Amino acid sequence: KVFERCELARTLKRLGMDGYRGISLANWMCLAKWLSGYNTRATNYNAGDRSTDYGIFQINSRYWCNDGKTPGAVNACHLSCSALLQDNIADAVACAKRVVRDPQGIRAWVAWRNRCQNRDVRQYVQGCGV
């Protein structure tokens, strides 16, 4: 599923993402936009390390989910990577929450640092009723 902006903002809000671990909804929106263009089916294979990023939050197979083809990988969210390719983003959100519980917080995604950190992200939630 490819979410429309405001539709996604309320979906994330209903799922408990607004201010989760101090992370605003605008920050999560900026992250998903740059990570997958709001596409839950988005996938990126990393030939260099044999891992794959799955879904709307491009969660990596090396540590967060299991796809059975990533050497010596862990499954910290305890989910099949298939779960991160569903139209329903409940499982992806549960895993995204798990990622940010670690030391780095939202900084776990290099993309967030590159395109969201210290940026004006107001634009992502404007007019969405969140």
Short mmCIF file of N, CA, C and O in Angstrom, two decimals, residues 12 17-18 22-34 57 106 112 115-119 121-122 124-125:
data_model
loop_
_atom_site.label_atom_id
_atom_site.label_comp_id
_atom_site.label_asym_id
_atom_site.label_seq_id
_atom_site.Cartn_x
_atom_site.Cartn_y
_atom_site.Cartn_z
N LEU A 12 -0.54 6.52 11.98
CA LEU A 12 0.56 6.44 12.94
C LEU A 12 0.08 6.94 14.31
O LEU A 12 0.39 6.34 15.34
N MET A 17 2.25 6.41 17.92
CA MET A 17 3.55 6.93 17.52
C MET A 17 3.82 8.39 17.86
O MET A 17 4.97 8.80 17.91
N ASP A 18 2.77 9.16 18.13
CA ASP A 18 2.96 10.58 18.42
C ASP A 18 3.65 10.81 19.75
O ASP A 18 3.04 10.64 20.81
N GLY A 22 9.72 10.32 22.91
CA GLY A 22 10.06 11.70 22.59
C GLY A 22 10.08 12.06 21.12
O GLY A 22 10.47 13.19 20.78
N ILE A 23 9.69 11.14 20.26
CA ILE A 23 9.68 11.37 18.81
C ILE A 23 8.32 11.84 18.30
O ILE A 23 7.33 11.11 18.35
N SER A 24 8.28 13.04 17.76
CA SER A 24 7.05 13.60 17.23
C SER A 24 6.57 12.84 15.98
O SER A 24 7.36 12.17 15.30
N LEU A 25 5.30 13.04 15.64
CA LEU A 25 4.69 12.45 14.47
C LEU A 25 5.36 13.01 13.20
O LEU A 25 5.61 12.28 12.25
N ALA A 26 5.68 14.31 13.20
CA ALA A 26 6.35 14.93 12.05
C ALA A 26 7.67 14.25 11.74
O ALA A 26 8.04 14.09 10.56
N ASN A 27 8.38 13.82 12.78
CA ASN A 27 9.64 13.13 12.60
C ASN A 27 9.45 11.77 11.96
O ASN A 27 10.20 11.39 11.06
N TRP A 28 8.43 11.03 12.39
CA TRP A 28 8.15 9.71 11.82
C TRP A 28 7.71 9.83 10.36
O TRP A 28 8.03 8.97 9.54
N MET A 29 6.93 10.86 10.06
CA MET A 29 6.46 11.13 8.71
C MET A 29 7.64 11.45 7.79
O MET A 29 7.73 10.91 6.69
N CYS A 30 8.53 12.33 8.23
CA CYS A 30 9.71 12.68 7.43
C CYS A 30 10.54 11.41 7.17
O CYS A 30 10.99 11.17 6.05
N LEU A 31 10.65 10.55 8.19
CA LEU A 31 11.40 9.31 8.07
C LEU A 31 10.80 8.36 7.01
O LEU A 31 11.50 7.91 6.11
N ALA A 32 9.51 8.07 7.12
CA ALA A 32 8.83 7.19 6.16
C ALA A 32 8.84 7.76 4.73
O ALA A 32 8.98 7.02 3.75
N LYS A 33 8.67 9.07 4.61
CA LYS A 33 8.66 9.71 3.31
C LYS A 33 9.98 9.48 2.58
O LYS A 33 10.01 9.05 1.43
N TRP A 34 11.08 9.75 3.27
CA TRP A 34 12.39 9.58 2.66
C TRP A 34 12.84 8.14 2.53
O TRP A 34 13.52 7.77 1.57
N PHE A 57 9.19 1.52 6.80
CA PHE A 57 10.29 2.04 7.61
C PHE A 57 11.64 1.41 7.26
O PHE A 57 12.62 1.55 8.01
N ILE A 106 15.60 7.62 17.37
CA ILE A 106 15.27 7.83 15.96
C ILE A 106 16.53 7.92 15.07
O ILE A 106 16.47 7.70 13.86
N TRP A 112 17.20 9.55 8.60
CA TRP A 112 16.60 10.56 9.48
C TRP A 112 17.63 11.67 9.73
O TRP A 112 17.31 12.86 9.69
N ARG A 115 18.02 13.66 6.25
CA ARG A 115 16.93 14.50 5.81
C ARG A 115 15.85 14.96 6.77
O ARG A 115 14.90 15.61 6.34
N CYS A 116 16.01 14.70 8.06
CA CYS A 116 14.99 15.11 9.03
C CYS A 116 15.53 15.88 10.21
O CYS A 116 14.89 16.82 10.68
N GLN A 117 16.67 15.43 10.73
CA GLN A 117 17.36 16.04 11.86
C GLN A 117 17.64 17.51 11.59
O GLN A 117 18.18 17.87 10.54
N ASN A 118 17.27 18.36 12.55
CA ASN A 118 17.47 19.80 12.44
C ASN A 118 16.88 20.38 11.17
O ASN A 118 17.43 21.30 10.58
N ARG A 119 15.76 19.84 10.74
CA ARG A 119 15.09 20.34 9.55
C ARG A 119 13.70 20.79 9.99
O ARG A 119 13.23 20.41 11.07
N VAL A 121 10.27 20.10 9.78
CA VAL A 121 9.39 19.01 9.36
C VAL A 121 7.89 19.28 9.57
O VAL A 121 7.06 18.39 9.37
N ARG A 122 7.54 20.52 9.93
CA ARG A 122 6.15 20.92 10.17
C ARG A 122 5.24 20.51 9.02
O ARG A 122 4.12 20.04 9.23
N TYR A 124 5.04 18.04 7.12
CA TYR A 124 4.57 16.66 7.03
C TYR A 124 3.24 16.34 7.71
O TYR A 124 2.54 15.42 7.27
N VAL A 125 2.88 17.11 8.74
CA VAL A 125 1.64 16.88 9.46
C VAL A 125 0.63 18.01 9.32
O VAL A 125 -0.48 17.92 9.84
#
